[PDB]
Amino acid sequence: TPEMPVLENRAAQGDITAPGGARRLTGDQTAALRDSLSDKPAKNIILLIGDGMGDSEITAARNYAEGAGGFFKGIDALPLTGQYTHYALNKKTGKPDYVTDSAASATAWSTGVKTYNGALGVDIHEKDHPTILEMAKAAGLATGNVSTAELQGATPAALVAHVTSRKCYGPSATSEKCPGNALEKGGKGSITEQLLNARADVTLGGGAKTFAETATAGEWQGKTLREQAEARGYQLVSDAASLNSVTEANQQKPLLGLFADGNMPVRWLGPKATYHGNIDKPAVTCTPNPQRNDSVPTLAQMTDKAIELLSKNEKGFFLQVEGASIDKQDHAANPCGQIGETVDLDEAVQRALEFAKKEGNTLVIVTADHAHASQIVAPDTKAPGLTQALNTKDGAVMVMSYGNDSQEHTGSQLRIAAYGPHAANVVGLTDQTDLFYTMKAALGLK
Amino acid sequence: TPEMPVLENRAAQGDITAPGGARRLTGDQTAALRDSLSDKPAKNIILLIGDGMGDSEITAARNYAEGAGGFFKGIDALPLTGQYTHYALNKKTGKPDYVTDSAASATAWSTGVKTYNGALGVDIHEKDHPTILEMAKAAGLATGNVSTAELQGATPAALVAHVTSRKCYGPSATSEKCPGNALEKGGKGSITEQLLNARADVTLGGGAKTFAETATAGEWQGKTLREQAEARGYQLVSDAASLNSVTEANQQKPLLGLFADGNMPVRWLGPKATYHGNIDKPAVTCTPNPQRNDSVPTLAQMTDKAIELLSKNEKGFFLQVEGASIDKQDHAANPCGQIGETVDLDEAVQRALEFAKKEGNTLVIVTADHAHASQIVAPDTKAPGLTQALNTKDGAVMVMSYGNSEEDSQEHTGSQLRIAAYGPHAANVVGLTDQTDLFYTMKAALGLK
Ligand SMILES: [Mg+2]
Ligand SMILES: [Mg+2]
Ligand SMILES: [Zn+2]
Ligand SMILES: [Zn+2]
Ligand SMILES: [Zn+2]
Ligand SMILES: [Zn+2]
């Protein structure tokens, strides 16, 4: 009867004001942990990436959505936890660049080598390196790339593209910013063109705008990239209904879901943080975004559908899901939008975790690419940045600050948690590039 | 039997610019982690607290002192890690107060009950609660309290005093701030008075200033608190030499080392962070304090002396060590001092890991009381707060920012933060947990009833 446990409940077990009422543990965990350690090979791997979800962003989201003594049933249910560094490299000197951008970090884990901010699947010498997705696929596994951002964003593109600059979304941008990658210059092409060639069995996300561009050379010159996809035998679905009608997705008929021109709609609506906002304004109570839709698939729905379609492959699969806008609303000083995306990712982690729990051979990892600006401060705080007071589930006020156009990333080490075989490799201090080797090893590649 | 190992080396394996060059792991950790789990009785416990040492402070200190791919022999060597919440309570409402202060958090782990910012050893109803040190000592276990801040500070005070306000350092303040605790009003006493009452075998730290205060009641009225200490059996020490000469420390010969009027000297010195400093001012290299003196013991030295004495007790011991100035300097927006204090603490963790690794039945816990405001930001950053560019061990610049305040100091923050542990019952720190869990994990580990 061996079954690996998932933290079923680590909420304040009682009365916050009373002795022991705030404890989250009801007994000794030594046994539960032992039952969580396995070195058996992992058949599948699901990697949930919260863009910019550092410990501060997690605590901010729990506080507001579940209450300080709350528990995220997905994000906090992962038994093995640790901390990992994610610094970039200075392209010229080759020294550490203490604060990474999404592209550099995304490469470190998907390819195993450090790089300079902005690089996508290339090292400082601009040399291409096979990403974990290309390798999983080479070994005959199924591959899935899901996100709530544009498939050209740093995190998803990192698994299927090798360009010198993240800004090379399509032919238009590539000719000018990545001339060496420009298809008409003998290169591999733009991120979108490379994505189309990588051919993952399932790719769900937004960023359909770029697919309207036409190739400047090659076999599909003059055809829009959307037409290319179709000519290459792709299944294009553009809404929840059709996404759900897909019975199978493979290499003969790979799926491509373009659910929005840019980023898919945010979950909650709310005002932007403001200078001395915590005082010049009443507490904010986030409200559901009316554009979220009954037709726009939610992140937990894409994770669920992709898991379904990918589990047909007898050999196994590799999946990457990105709760994307947490990073964006963080950059936008919009507490509600930021918090909503976190809750949104929690629902996704839940699905992945329920599956992994029954299959017994899945490695589920939840982490972030880099930390962000958001900080939870005292109610009466008078900071120089932008602040906003929110009404938390505890019926209490929580103040948030953004003080570093937009808010930047920070280089603090952040949480990384896992569940399943080889999850033991996330405990303690590790580096982001370690994630590549952990996955390469668990999946049995090479 | 494979007796629990520490993470030997988690430093970047090689050339960080090559594939797998920045890796920290050499192989699979599964087996290594299996041998680190033990639910057997912990004979002793050592709790190293870093005031304001969140993941952000840890990083900055590492980047600077050992390079990004560097590794902290102490702090980073603990095998079992996790993240814990430390929210406080709003006294009047009983509702959560997301950003705790030093007082409420220290109380949280020493007594296992949540309280309000400012309180020490009492809940929102002002009722007292026995602390882990009072309990430990009550079981016959030798106990020690060590800090580099003044001994009346929140962290060391929370272990021996129960007052409704951290400000109640001595007789004077207490009379006006904690009336119900004022010895004249039948109160149990000021922080310092209760300190002396607590009688911990080993007590080392600064804050001799309040010891000059004179009692206003009790069997020692008119006598200064220092005179009282001596008259009660305490053996005073004011410098490294005399600290080193001390061979015994127990219940009838308790040790009390006061090495400063206020807090002790900070390890590294450096200029203050300034508006756009990273842009308008050069990269700082931290300058060792010329005045830390050979006459003043370091945290590591105090830790080792404490362990030398406390271990002579056959029953076992409880030790809390506090790397104090990180928080204060973090408040001061003084990068170099903040980093110096994290380095100072790392050496102490190394000392403790050394003892535990040998003894084999010692739980060592390394955590912080709450997260602070410092963040590591991009070098070309134009923030609204105080910023400073430093010269790290890598020969590259790192910019720290302080921008959560426009008032006198840099505030605390409510983010969940790292907690690491090594030894029997270390498994209880993995995953998400609350600061109050730390009390129960310790009490249960020590077998305290
Ligand atoms: Mg991204
Ligand atoms: Mg303290
Ligand atoms: Zn990011
Ligand atoms: Zn970002
Ligand atoms: Zn503190
Ligand atoms: Zn403080």
Side-chain angles (χ1 to χ4, degrees), chain A residues 294-325:
Chain A
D294 205 64
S295 53
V296 172
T298 54
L299 189 62
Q301 285 170 347
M302 300 190 282
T303 302
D304 220 74
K305 196 55 168 161
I307 286 179
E308 175 202 311
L309 301 169
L310 268 33
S311 48
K312 307 290 194 63
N313 189 306
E314 310 196 330
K315 286 296 187 303
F317 70 82
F318 167 81
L319 179 62
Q320 183 181 286
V321 184
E322 178 196 35
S325 288

PDB file of all heavy atoms in Angstrom, chain A residues 294-325:
ATOM      1  N   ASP A 294     -16.656  32.356 -20.081  1.00  0.00           N
ATOM      2  CA  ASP A 294     -17.181  31.007 -20.001  1.00  0.00           C
ATOM      3  C   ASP A 294     -16.627  30.303 -21.246  1.00  0.00           C
ATOM      4  O   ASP A 294     -16.832  29.105 -21.444  1.00  0.00           O
ATOM      5  CB  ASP A 294     -18.716  31.081 -20.066  1.00  0.00           C
ATOM      6  CG  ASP A 294     -19.400  29.898 -19.406  1.00  0.00           C
ATOM      7  OD1 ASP A 294     -19.263  29.724 -18.171  1.00  0.00           O
ATOM      8  OD2 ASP A 294     -20.111  29.163 -20.123  1.00  0.00           O
ATOM      9  N   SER A 295     -15.967  31.082 -22.104  1.00  0.00           N
ATOM     10  CA  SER A 295     -15.368  30.588 -23.338  1.00  0.00           C
ATOM     11  C   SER A 295     -13.842  30.582 -23.286  1.00  0.00           C
ATOM     12  O   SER A 295     -13.214  29.818 -24.007  1.00  0.00           O
ATOM     13  CB  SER A 295     -15.840  31.413 -24.539  1.00  0.00           C
ATOM     14  OG  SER A 295     -15.635  32.801 -24.327  1.00  0.00           O
ATOM     15  N   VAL A 296     -13.240  31.463 -22.489  1.00  0.00           N
ATOM     16  CA  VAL A 296     -11.778  31.497 -22.374  1.00  0.00           C
ATOM     17  C   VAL A 296     -11.425  30.429 -21.349  1.00  0.00           C
ATOM     18  O   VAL A 296     -11.904  30.475 -20.213  1.00  0.00           O
ATOM     19  CB  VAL A 296     -11.255  32.860 -21.861  1.00  0.00           C
ATOM     20  CG1 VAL A 296      -9.770  32.776 -21.576  1.00  0.00           C
ATOM     21  CG2 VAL A 296     -11.515  33.940 -22.883  1.00  0.00           C
ATOM     22  N   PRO A 297     -10.617  29.432 -21.742  1.00  0.00           N
ATOM     23  CA  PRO A 297     -10.247  28.376 -20.801  1.00  0.00           C
ATOM     24  C   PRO A 297      -9.363  28.908 -19.679  1.00  0.00           C
ATOM     25  O   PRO A 297      -8.529  29.773 -19.896  1.00  0.00           O
ATOM     26  CB  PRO A 297      -9.526  27.372 -21.693  1.00  0.00           C
ATOM     27  CG  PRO A 297      -8.897  28.226 -22.715  1.00  0.00           C
ATOM     28  CD  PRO A 297      -9.955  29.236 -23.043  1.00  0.00           C
ATOM     29  N   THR A 298      -9.593  28.436 -18.465  1.00  0.00           N
ATOM     30  CA  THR A 298      -8.803  28.864 -17.326  1.00  0.00           C
ATOM     31  C   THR A 298      -7.541  28.025 -17.293  1.00  0.00           C
ATOM     32  O   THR A 298      -7.496  26.962 -17.912  1.00  0.00           O
ATOM     33  CB  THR A 298      -9.573  28.655 -16.026  1.00  0.00           C
ATOM     34  OG1 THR A 298     -10.017  27.296 -15.937  1.00  0.00           O
ATOM     35  CG2 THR A 298     -10.773  29.573 -15.991  1.00  0.00           C
ATOM     36  N   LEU A 299      -6.536  28.464 -16.535  1.00  0.00           N
ATOM     37  CA  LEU A 299      -5.274  27.731 -16.450  1.00  0.00           C
ATOM     38  C   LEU A 299      -5.434  26.284 -15.962  1.00  0.00           C
ATOM     39  O   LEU A 299      -4.718  25.388 -16.431  1.00  0.00           O
ATOM     40  CB  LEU A 299      -4.252  28.471 -15.587  1.00  0.00           C
ATOM     41  CG  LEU A 299      -2.851  27.854 -15.642  1.00  0.00           C
ATOM     42  CD1 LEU A 299      -2.334  27.917 -17.056  1.00  0.00           C
ATOM     43  CD2 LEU A 299      -1.898  28.550 -14.688  1.00  0.00           C
ATOM     44  N   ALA A 300      -6.361  26.040 -15.035  1.00  0.00           N
ATOM     45  CA  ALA A 300      -6.582  24.682 -14.542  1.00  0.00           C
ATOM     46  C   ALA A 300      -7.273  23.817 -15.597  1.00  0.00           C
ATOM     47  O   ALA A 300      -7.191  22.591 -15.553  1.00  0.00           O
ATOM     48  CB  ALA A 300      -7.384  24.700 -13.258  1.00  0.00           C
ATOM     49  N   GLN A 301      -7.947  24.456 -16.549  1.00  0.00           N
ATOM     50  CA  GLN A 301      -8.629  23.737 -17.624  1.00  0.00           C
ATOM     51  C   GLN A 301      -7.637  23.330 -18.716  1.00  0.00           C
ATOM     52  O   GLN A 301      -7.753  22.257 -19.307  1.00  0.00           O
ATOM     53  CB  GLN A 301      -9.763  24.585 -18.207  1.00  0.00           C
ATOM     54  CG  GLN A 301     -10.998  24.649 -17.310  1.00  0.00           C
ATOM     55  CD  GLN A 301     -12.030  25.667 -17.765  1.00  0.00           C
ATOM     56  OE1 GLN A 301     -11.763  26.509 -18.613  1.00  0.00           O
ATOM     57  NE2 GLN A 301     -13.199  25.622 -17.161  1.00  0.00           N
ATOM     58  N   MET A 302      -6.655  24.186 -18.977  1.00  0.00           N
ATOM     59  CA  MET A 302      -5.635  23.882 -19.970  1.00  0.00           C
ATOM     60  C   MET A 302      -4.739  22.780 -19.401  1.00  0.00           C
ATOM     61  O   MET A 302      -4.406  21.828 -20.097  1.00  0.00           O
ATOM     62  CB  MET A 302      -4.819  25.134 -20.319  1.00  0.00           C
ATOM     63  CG  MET A 302      -5.661  26.253 -20.893  1.00  0.00           C
ATOM     64  SD  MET A 302      -4.739  27.630 -21.565  1.00  0.00           S
ATOM     65  CE  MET A 302      -4.253  28.499 -20.104  1.00  0.00           C
ATOM     66  N   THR A 303      -4.392  22.891 -18.125  1.00  0.00           N
ATOM     67  CA  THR A 303      -3.564  21.889 -17.460  1.00  0.00           C
ATOM     68  C   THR A 303      -4.282  20.538 -17.488  1.00  0.00           C
ATOM     69  O   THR A 303      -3.673  19.506 -17.770  1.00  0.00           O
ATOM     70  CB  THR A 303      -3.299  22.293 -15.998  1.00  0.00           C
ATOM     71  OG1 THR A 303      -2.664  23.575 -15.973  1.00  0.00           O
ATOM     72  CG2 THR A 303      -2.412  21.287 -15.290  1.00  0.00           C
ATOM     73  N   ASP A 304      -5.590  20.567 -17.236  1.00  0.00           N
ATOM     74  CA  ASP A 304      -6.409  19.364 -17.225  1.00  0.00           C
ATOM     75  C   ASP A 304      -6.520  18.714 -18.603  1.00  0.00           C
ATOM     76  O   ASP A 304      -6.334  17.504 -18.732  1.00  0.00           O
ATOM     77  CB  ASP A 304      -7.794  19.686 -16.680  1.00  0.00           C
ATOM     78  CG  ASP A 304      -8.324  18.601 -15.764  1.00  0.00           C
ATOM     79  OD1 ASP A 304      -7.844  18.480 -14.611  1.00  0.00           O
ATOM     80  OD2 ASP A 304      -9.237  17.872 -16.195  1.00  0.00           O
ATOM     81  N   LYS A 305      -6.780  19.516 -19.634  1.00  0.00           N
ATOM     82  CA  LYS A 305      -6.905  19.000 -20.998  1.00  0.00           C
ATOM     83  C   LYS A 305      -5.568  18.468 -21.505  1.00  0.00           C
ATOM     84  O   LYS A 305      -5.500  17.369 -22.057  1.00  0.00           O
ATOM     85  CB  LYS A 305      -7.435  20.076 -21.937  1.00  0.00           C
ATOM     86  CG  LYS A 305      -7.952  19.533 -23.248  1.00  0.00           C
ATOM     87  CD  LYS A 305      -9.013  18.455 -23.027  1.00  0.00           C
ATOM     88  CE  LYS A 305      -9.739  18.114 -24.329  1.00  0.00           C
ATOM     89  NZ  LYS A 305     -10.430  16.796 -24.258  1.00  0.00           N
ATOM     90  N   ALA A 306      -4.500  19.233 -21.302  1.00  0.00           N
ATOM     91  CA  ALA A 306      -3.180  18.807 -21.720  1.00  0.00           C
ATOM     92  C   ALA A 306      -2.796  17.506 -21.013  1.00  0.00           C
ATOM     93  O   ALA A 306      -2.269  16.594 -21.635  1.00  0.00           O
ATOM     94  CB  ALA A 306      -2.170  19.887 -21.446  1.00  0.00           C
ATOM     95  N   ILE A 307      -3.063  17.405 -19.716  1.00  0.00           N
ATOM     96  CA  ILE A 307      -2.744  16.174 -18.989  1.00  0.00           C
ATOM     97  C   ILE A 307      -3.473  14.976 -19.602  1.00  0.00           C
ATOM     98  O   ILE A 307      -2.895  13.904 -19.760  1.00  0.00           O
ATOM     99  CB  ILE A 307      -3.080  16.291 -17.488  1.00  0.00           C
ATOM    100  CG1 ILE A 307      -2.057  17.177 -16.787  1.00  0.00           C
ATOM    101  CG2 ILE A 307      -3.067  14.936 -16.832  1.00  0.00           C
ATOM    102  CD1 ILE A 307      -2.328  17.371 -15.315  1.00  0.00           C
ATOM    103  N   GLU A 308      -4.733  15.183 -19.976  1.00  0.00           N
ATOM    104  CA  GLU A 308      -5.571  14.147 -20.588  1.00  0.00           C
ATOM    105  C   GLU A 308      -4.990  13.670 -21.926  1.00  0.00           C
ATOM    106  O   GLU A 308      -4.714  12.481 -22.115  1.00  0.00           O
ATOM    107  CB  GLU A 308      -6.976  14.709 -20.812  1.00  0.00           C
ATOM    108  CG  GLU A 308      -7.930  13.785 -21.546  1.00  0.00           C
ATOM    109  CD  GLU A 308      -9.092  14.540 -22.196  1.00  0.00           C
ATOM    110  OE1 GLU A 308      -9.734  15.368 -21.510  1.00  0.00           O
ATOM    111  OE2 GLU A 308      -9.359  14.308 -23.399  1.00  0.00           O
ATOM    112  N   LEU A 309      -4.797  14.610 -22.845  1.00  0.00           N
ATOM    113  CA  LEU A 309      -4.249  14.316 -24.161  1.00  0.00           C
ATOM    114  C   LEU A 309      -2.839  13.714 -24.116  1.00  0.00           C
ATOM    115  O   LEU A 309      -2.520  12.830 -24.909  1.00  0.00           O
ATOM    116  CB  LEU A 309      -4.266  15.589 -25.015  1.00  0.00           C
ATOM    117  CG  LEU A 309      -5.660  16.198 -25.202  1.00  0.00           C
ATOM    118  CD1 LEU A 309      -5.575  17.570 -25.804  1.00  0.00           C
ATOM    119  CD2 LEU A 309      -6.518  15.308 -26.061  1.00  0.00           C
ATOM    120  N   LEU A 310      -2.017  14.158 -23.165  1.00  0.00           N
ATOM    121  CA  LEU A 310      -0.640  13.678 -23.033  1.00  0.00           C
ATOM    122  C   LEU A 310      -0.507  12.289 -22.417  1.00  0.00           C
ATOM    123  O   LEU A 310       0.474  11.583 -22.674  1.00  0.00           O
ATOM    124  CB  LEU A 310       0.199  14.676 -22.220  1.00  0.00           C
ATOM    125  CG  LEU A 310       0.995  15.796 -22.900  1.00  0.00           C
ATOM    126  CD1 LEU A 310       0.300  16.278 -24.134  1.00  0.00           C
ATOM    127  CD2 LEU A 310       1.202  16.941 -21.933  1.00  0.00           C
ATOM    128  N   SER A 311      -1.492  11.889 -21.617  1.00  0.00           N
ATOM    129  CA  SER A 311      -1.438  10.590 -20.965  1.00  0.00           C
ATOM    130  C   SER A 311      -1.766   9.396 -21.876  1.00  0.00           C
ATOM    131  O   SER A 311      -1.848   8.254 -21.418  1.00  0.00           O
ATOM    132  CB  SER A 311      -2.292  10.596 -19.696  1.00  0.00           C
ATOM    133  OG  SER A 311      -3.572  11.141 -19.940  1.00  0.00           O
ATOM    134  N   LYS A 312      -1.964   9.665 -23.163  1.00  0.00           N
ATOM    135  CA  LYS A 312      -2.229   8.608 -24.139  1.00  0.00           C
ATOM    136  C   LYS A 312      -0.868   7.981 -24.500  1.00  0.00           C
ATOM    137  O   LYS A 312      -0.753   6.765 -24.708  1.00  0.00           O
ATOM    138  CB  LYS A 312      -2.864   9.188 -25.406  1.00  0.00           C
ATOM    139  CG  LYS A 312      -4.096  10.055 -25.181  1.00  0.00           C
ATOM    140  CD  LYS A 312      -5.295   9.252 -24.721  1.00  0.00           C
ATOM    141  CE  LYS A 312      -6.594  10.065 -24.831  1.00  0.00           C
ATOM    142  NZ  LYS A 312      -6.935  10.455 -26.238  1.00  0.00           N
ATOM    143  N   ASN A 313       0.167   8.818 -24.564  1.00  0.00           N
ATOM    144  CA  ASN A 313       1.501   8.332 -24.893  1.00  0.00           C
ATOM    145  C   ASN A 313       2.016   7.368 -23.835  1.00  0.00           C
ATOM    146  O   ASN A 313       2.407   7.773 -22.737  1.00  0.00           O
ATOM    147  CB  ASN A 313       2.508   9.476 -25.086  1.00  0.00           C
ATOM    148  CG  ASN A 313       3.852   8.978 -25.640  1.00  0.00           C
ATOM    149  OD1 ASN A 313       4.470   8.081 -25.071  1.00  0.00           O
ATOM    150  ND2 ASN A 313       4.277   9.524 -26.775  1.00  0.00           N
ATOM    151  N   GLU A 314       2.044   6.095 -24.213  1.00  0.00           N
ATOM    152  CA  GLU A 314       2.510   5.007 -23.360  1.00  0.00           C
ATOM    153  C   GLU A 314       3.849   5.304 -22.681  1.00  0.00           C
ATOM    154  O   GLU A 314       4.043   4.947 -21.522  1.00  0.00           O
ATOM    155  CB  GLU A 314       2.624   3.712 -24.186  1.00  0.00           C
ATOM    156  CG  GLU A 314       1.362   3.377 -25.008  1.00  0.00           C
ATOM    157  CD  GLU A 314       1.309   1.931 -25.515  1.00  0.00           C
ATOM    158  OE1 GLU A 314       2.381   1.330 -25.766  1.00  0.00           O
ATOM    159  OE2 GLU A 314       0.181   1.400 -25.666  1.00  0.00           O
ATOM    160  N   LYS A 315       4.760   5.963 -23.397  1.00  0.00           N
ATOM    161  CA  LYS A 315       6.086   6.283 -22.870  1.00  0.00           C
ATOM    162  C   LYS A 315       6.124   7.309 -21.746  1.00  0.00           C
ATOM    163  O   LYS A 315       7.035   7.280 -20.912  1.00  0.00           O
ATOM    164  CB  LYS A 315       7.022   6.740 -23.994  1.00  0.00           C
ATOM    165  CG  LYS A 315       7.509   5.638 -24.925  1.00  0.00           C
ATOM    166  CD  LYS A 315       8.370   4.626 -24.175  1.00  0.00           C
ATOM    167  CE  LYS A 315       9.015   3.609 -25.121  1.00  0.00           C
ATOM    168  NZ  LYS A 315       8.023   2.864 -25.952  1.00  0.00           N
ATOM    169  N   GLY A 316       5.169   8.233 -21.738  1.00  0.00           N
ATOM    170  CA  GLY A 316       5.153   9.260 -20.705  1.00  0.00           C
ATOM    171  C   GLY A 316       5.147  10.650 -21.314  1.00  0.00           C
ATOM    172  O   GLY A 316       5.013  10.784 -22.535  1.00  0.00           O
ATOM    173  N   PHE A 317       5.291  11.689 -20.494  1.00  0.00           N
ATOM    174  CA  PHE A 317       5.282  13.054 -21.012  1.00  0.00           C
ATOM    175  C   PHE A 317       5.973  14.101 -20.144  1.00  0.00           C
ATOM    176  O   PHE A 317       6.361  13.829 -19.006  1.00  0.00           O
ATOM    177  CB  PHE A 317       3.841  13.506 -21.297  1.00  0.00           C
ATOM    178  CG  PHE A 317       2.993  13.728 -20.057  1.00  0.00           C
ATOM    179  CD1 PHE A 317       3.069  14.925 -19.343  1.00  0.00           C
ATOM    180  CD2 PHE A 317       2.072  12.769 -19.647  1.00  0.00           C
ATOM    181  CE1 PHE A 317       2.242  15.161 -18.253  1.00  0.00           C
ATOM    182  CE2 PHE A 317       1.238  13.000 -18.552  1.00  0.00           C
ATOM    183  CZ  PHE A 317       1.324  14.199 -17.857  1.00  0.00           C
ATOM    184  N   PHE A 318       6.146  15.292 -20.708  1.00  0.00           N
ATOM    185  CA  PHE A 318       6.748  16.420 -20.007  1.00  0.00           C
ATOM    186  C   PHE A 318       5.809  17.595 -20.244  1.00  0.00           C
ATOM    187  O   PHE A 318       5.466  17.891 -21.391  1.00  0.00           O
ATOM    188  CB  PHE A 318       8.147  16.754 -20.551  1.00  0.00           C
ATOM    189  CG  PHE A 318       8.670  18.095 -20.080  1.00  0.00           C
ATOM    190  CD1 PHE A 318       9.257  18.231 -18.827  1.00  0.00           C
ATOM    191  CD2 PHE A 318       8.534  19.233 -20.872  1.00  0.00           C
ATOM    192  CE1 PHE A 318       9.672  19.481 -18.368  1.00  0.00           C
ATOM    193  CE2 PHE A 318       8.949  20.479 -20.415  1.00  0.00           C
ATOM    194  CZ  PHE A 318       9.521  20.599 -19.170  1.00  0.00           C
ATOM    195  N   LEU A 319       5.439  18.287 -19.173  1.00  0.00           N
ATOM    196  CA  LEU A 319       4.523  19.418 -19.258  1.00  0.00           C
ATOM    197  C   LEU A 319       5.065  20.629 -18.503  1.00  0.00           C
ATOM    198  O   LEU A 319       5.710  20.475 -17.471  1.00  0.00           O
ATOM    199  CB  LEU A 319       3.168  19.011 -18.663  1.00  0.00           C
ATOM    200  CG  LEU A 319       2.018  20.013 -18.601  1.00  0.00           C
ATOM    201  CD1 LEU A 319       1.638  20.437 -19.990  1.00  0.00           C
ATOM    202  CD2 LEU A 319       0.825  19.400 -17.904  1.00  0.00           C
ATOM    203  N   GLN A 320       4.862  21.819 -19.049  1.00  0.00           N
ATOM    204  CA  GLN A 320       5.283  23.039 -18.382  1.00  0.00           C
ATOM    205  C   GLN A 320       4.058  23.925 -18.444  1.00  0.00           C
ATOM    206  O   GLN A 320       3.444  24.048 -19.500  1.00  0.00           O
ATOM    207  CB  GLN A 320       6.456  23.737 -19.088  1.00  0.00           C
ATOM    208  CG  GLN A 320       6.927  24.999 -18.324  1.00  0.00           C
ATOM    209  CD  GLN A 320       8.079  25.755 -18.979  1.00  0.00           C
ATOM    210  OE1 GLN A 320       9.229  25.311 -18.952  1.00  0.00           O
ATOM    211  NE2 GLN A 320       7.779  26.925 -19.518  1.00  0.00           N
ATOM    212  N   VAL A 321       3.657  24.468 -17.304  1.00  0.00           N
ATOM    213  CA  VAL A 321       2.494  25.343 -17.238  1.00  0.00           C
ATOM    214  C   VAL A 321       2.990  26.622 -16.593  1.00  0.00           C
ATOM    215  O   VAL A 321       3.778  26.569 -15.633  1.00  0.00           O
ATOM    216  CB  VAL A 321       1.390  24.749 -16.340  1.00  0.00           C
ATOM    217  CG1 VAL A 321       0.176  25.623 -16.359  1.00  0.00           C
ATOM    218  CG2 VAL A 321       1.035  23.346 -16.784  1.00  0.00           C
ATOM    219  N   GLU A 322       2.565  27.765 -17.118  1.00  0.00           N
ATOM    220  CA  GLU A 322       2.984  29.037 -16.553  1.00  0.00           C
ATOM    221  C   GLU A 322       1.789  29.913 -16.189  1.00  0.00           C
ATOM    222  O   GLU A 322       1.000  30.312 -17.050  1.00  0.00           O
ATOM    223  CB  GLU A 322       3.855  29.827 -17.547  1.00  0.00           C
ATOM    224  CG  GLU A 322       4.263  31.199 -16.995  1.00  0.00           C
ATOM    225  CD  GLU A 322       4.791  32.166 -18.059  1.00  0.00           C
ATOM    226  OE1 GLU A 322       4.304  32.150 -19.251  1.00  0.00           O
ATOM    227  OE2 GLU A 322       5.729  33.001 -17.757  1.00  0.00           O
ATOM    228  N   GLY A 323       1.658  30.168 -14.900  1.00  0.00           N
ATOM    229  CA  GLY A 323       0.711  31.180 -14.428  1.00  0.00           C
ATOM    230  C   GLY A 323       1.474  32.446 -14.733  1.00  0.00           C
ATOM    231  O   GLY A 323       2.425  32.789 -14.029  1.00  0.00           O
ATOM    232  N   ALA A 324       1.081  33.116 -15.784  1.00  0.00           N
ATOM    233  CA  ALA A 324       1.920  34.182 -16.333  1.00  0.00           C
ATOM    234  C   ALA A 324       1.794  35.587 -15.789  1.00  0.00           C
ATOM    235  O   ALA A 324       2.801  36.171 -15.377  1.00  0.00           O
ATOM    236  CB  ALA A 324       1.692  34.324 -17.838  1.00  0.00           C
ATOM    237  N   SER A 325       0.593  36.157 -15.785  1.00  0.00           N
ATOM    238  CA  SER A 325       0.450  37.540 -15.321  1.00  0.00           C
ATOM    239  C   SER A 325       0.826  37.965 -13.888  1.00  0.00           C
ATOM    240  O   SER A 325       0.864  39.167 -13.597  1.00  0.00           O
ATOM    241  CB  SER A 325      -0.903  38.112 -15.743  1.00  0.00           C
ATOM    242  OG  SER A 325      -0.895  38.342 -17.147  1.00  0.00           O
TER     243      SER A 325
END
